[PDB]
Ligand binder design. Sequence first.
Ligand SMILES: CC(C)CN(C[C@@H](O)[C@H](Cc1cc(F)cc(F)c1)NC(=O)O[C@H]1[C@H]2CO[C@H]3OC[C@@H]1[C@H]3C2)S(=O)(=O)c1ccc2nc(NC3CC3)sc2c1
Lengths: 99, 99
Amino acid sequence: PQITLWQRPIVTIKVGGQLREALIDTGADDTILEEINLPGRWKPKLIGGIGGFIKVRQYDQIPIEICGHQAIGTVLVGPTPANVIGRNMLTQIGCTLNF
Amino acid sequence: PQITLWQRPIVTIKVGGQLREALIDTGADDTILEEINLPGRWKPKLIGGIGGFIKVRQYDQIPIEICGHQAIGTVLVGPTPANVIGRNMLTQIGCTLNF
Ligand SMILES: CC(C)CN(C[C@@H](O)[C@H](Cc1cc(F)cc(F)c1)NC(=O)O[C@H]1[C@H]2CO[C@H]3OC[C@@H]1[C@H]3C2)S(=O)(=O)c1ccc2nc(NC3CC3)sc2c1
C-alpha cells in the first residue's frame, strides 16, 4: 500500500504465531515489540531512545509478516511503549518515503 | 525525493534561521529538536518515548524548511538524542510511505 501520515501508520503483523499491530517507524533502526512470547535463544541488550534506555531480549532470524509481506530478521522484545517496525525489516518489504 | 531506508532517512532543515540535520520519523507524532535557540513564548511539556520521558519547550507556529519544502507548526525543543521530523510536519510536505 501507500500510507499517508495523517494518522499513525499502524499495520497488522504476524510474528511468533501471534497477531499484533505495529507502527511503521522510519526513525527506528531496529524492530522492537512489547512483551511477546518468542521461541528459542536470545541475548540481553540495552537500547536508547527518547527518555533513556531499556533492557530488551534480542532474537535473531525471526520471521514476520508485515501487512502481508514476508521478512526475517532481528526482533527486540522489551518494555517499549509501542510496537515498532524498524528499517531492518522495512528495507526487506521495499518500504520507501516519498514527497 | 524518494528516500529508501537502507540508511537513516536524514535530511537538511532550516529552522529559527539555523541549519540542522534531522530524521524523517514516521513513528514520531511531533517534531523534536535538540537544544536550539528559537524566538518567543514557549510552554514546558513532558513527552514520552522508549526509555521514559523528557521535559521539552513547546514552540507553536514555527516555520521550517524540510529538504526544500516549507511547513509551519509546533516544534518541541529538549534533550532528544536525535532531531526528528514528526507527522505534524511530514503531512504538510506530502510525505507518504510506500511498499
Ligand atoms: C514510538 C516511539 C518509539 C516514537 N519515537 C520516535 C522513534 O522513531 C524514535 C526516534 C529516535 C531516534 C533516535 F536515533 C534516538 C532517539 F532517541 C529517538 N526512535 C527510537 O525509539 O529508536 C531507538 C530504538 C530503535 O532501534 C534503534 O534506532 C534508534 C534507537 C535504537 C533503539 S520518539 O523519539 O520516542 C517520539 C518522537 C516524537 C513524539 N511525539 C510525540 N507526541 C505526543 C504523542 C502525541 S510522542 C513522541 C515520541
